[PDB]
Homo-oligomer: A and B are copies of this chain.
Amino acid sequence: SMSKLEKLLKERGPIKKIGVLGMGYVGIPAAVLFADAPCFEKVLGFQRNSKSSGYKIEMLNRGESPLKGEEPGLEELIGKVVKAGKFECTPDFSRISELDAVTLAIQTPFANPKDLEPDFSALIDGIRNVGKYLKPGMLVVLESTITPGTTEGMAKQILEEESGLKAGEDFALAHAPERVMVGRLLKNIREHDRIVGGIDEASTKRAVELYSPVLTVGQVIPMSATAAEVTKTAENTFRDLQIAAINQLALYCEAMGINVYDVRTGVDSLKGEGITRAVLWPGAGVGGHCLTKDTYHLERGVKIGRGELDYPEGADSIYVLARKVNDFMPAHMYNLTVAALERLGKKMDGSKVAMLGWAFIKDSDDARNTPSEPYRDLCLKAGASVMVHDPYVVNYPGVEISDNLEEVVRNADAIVVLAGHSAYSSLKADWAKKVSAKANPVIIDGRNVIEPDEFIGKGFVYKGIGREGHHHHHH
């Protein structure tokens, strides 16, 4: 026998009419990709006539991207689709009642780099609106990043509050997280696998049907709604633990006086699917939101659903431990620099520190949740002047970034490399010795961009993360 949802869905036929709420970095390529598909009729992108965002309706309704910025193929694609009557931007949210599938791709901000919980108000709004206008036989996919259990929890509860209908009876609900990078938007979508999880089999197939058409090389990875949200968190939690594994090897190697890079490359010689080890690079910390928060969401997720967990006792989980080792890396950089100044008898209080790197990703502009900030704070509290350099980061809240190397390195007692920028990989000992003066300048390298022998030979007191065996060198 067929269940109630299955009847309704086969009774709808296929998906012809798609709606995308959230006209930002992620919902625009989505809506437009949906619309560029042969087998779909219209897609409606929903955007309220805000004084902040109303201009998106007119920019988009004419084939133009409201964003920053160039994003290869994007402007072009929107144009392609606006012309054919297959894409329209609207503030009329009561449309939605006319759709087969509705998707929510609303940005999920964060107040301050305020620890764990992003702000969801914009998203919950989208969901209320969906619920207000939701009809039986509709497919609703949450595409925003959400914390495990949101689909089966609140998202379901408000969607059912608003409509009087039941998820998995009157309508389908799924989650399809969008793993995506600005710059490579359209084709990352196109080219890699999409995770798709409904609250039931009926909902996951209805979604497979949504996402299949947009893919050229990517496949859909079908699963449950919760399994999908946990996949987002787990992918970050695991990369985090990989980083914390080598950071810890780095610390172990320093105490043993050996080079972590040689141990790393020995480990790395083990190749093969299910064999590798997949060893990452050690460094001066971990920045971003995902890598620094997703284990807490996975752990909160275990807690919120009150399923029965057995685990060794009541302690910390390796993931939490990974968070803490990774979090310690800035203070470790600092102990290194204090140690380096000590070899000369030089304090900190009233030292100049030239910090090289605010962003934490090589040749990039995001300093969000930067390991550089906890480091700056330790230097400032201990009594040092600090000047900061980064050739990409433009304007950061209440901290001065100079683009002028040299202005930054002038009179510096210590030069501290926190970001693996290309510019720092071309930093020559000669120049740094001559612009900082001093007589023994200190250089602390947290990103494997300094060749130690060049600097040591130049009068520098060198330290490097995980370095032998370099750190107790003669000057």
Q: Is there an interface contact between A223 and B321, defined as CB atoms closer than 8 Å?
A: no
Within 8 A of B (CB), among A216-269: 221-224, 226-228, 230-231, 234-235, 238-239, 241-242, 244-245, 248-249, 251-259, 262-263, 265-267, 269
Bound complex: CA A309 to CA B325 (Å): 13
Q: Assuming A227-B259, A318-B325, A319-B248, is B267 touching A238 (CB within 8 A)?
A: yes
Does any Cβ of B come within 8 Å of A4's Cβ? no
Name A316's contact: one of B148, B321, B468 (CB within 8 Å): B321
22 pairs, A vs B, C-beta closer than 8 Å: A149-B256, A222-B262, A223-B266, A227-B263, A231-B263, A231-B267, A235-B270, A235-B277, A239-B277, A242-B277, A254-B308, A254-B309, A255-B309, A255-B310, A256-B302, A272-B276, A273-B278, A274-B281, A276-B276, A310-B335, A312-B331, A316-B321
Q: Which residues of B contact A277 (CB under 8 A)?
A: 235, 238-239, 242, 278
In the complex, what's the smallest C-beta–C-beta distance from A30 to chain B, in angstroms? 19
Q: Is there an interface contact between B325 and A312, defined as CB atoms closer than 8 Å?
A: yes
Name A259's contact: one of B224, B281, B332 (CB within 8 Å): B224
Q: Which residues of B contact A256 (CB under 8 A)?
A: 148-149, 226, 230, 301-302, 304-305, 307
Residue of B nearest to A230 (CB): B263
Q: Assuming A257-B305, A272-B278, is B226 touching A266 (CB within 8 A)?
A: no
- Of the four ranges (under 10, 10 to 19, 20 to 34, 35 or more), the interface on chain A belongs to 35 or more
In the complex, what's the smallest C-beta–C-beta distance from A465 to chain B, in angstroms? 11
Bound complex: CA A322 to CA B316 (Å): 10
Residue of B nearest to A305 (CB): B256
Q: Which residues of B contact A276 (CB under 8 A)?
A: 272, 276, 278
Q: Assuming A307-B256, A335-B310, is B321 touching A228 (CB within 8 A)?
A: no
Bound complex: CA A60 to CA B302 (Å): 60
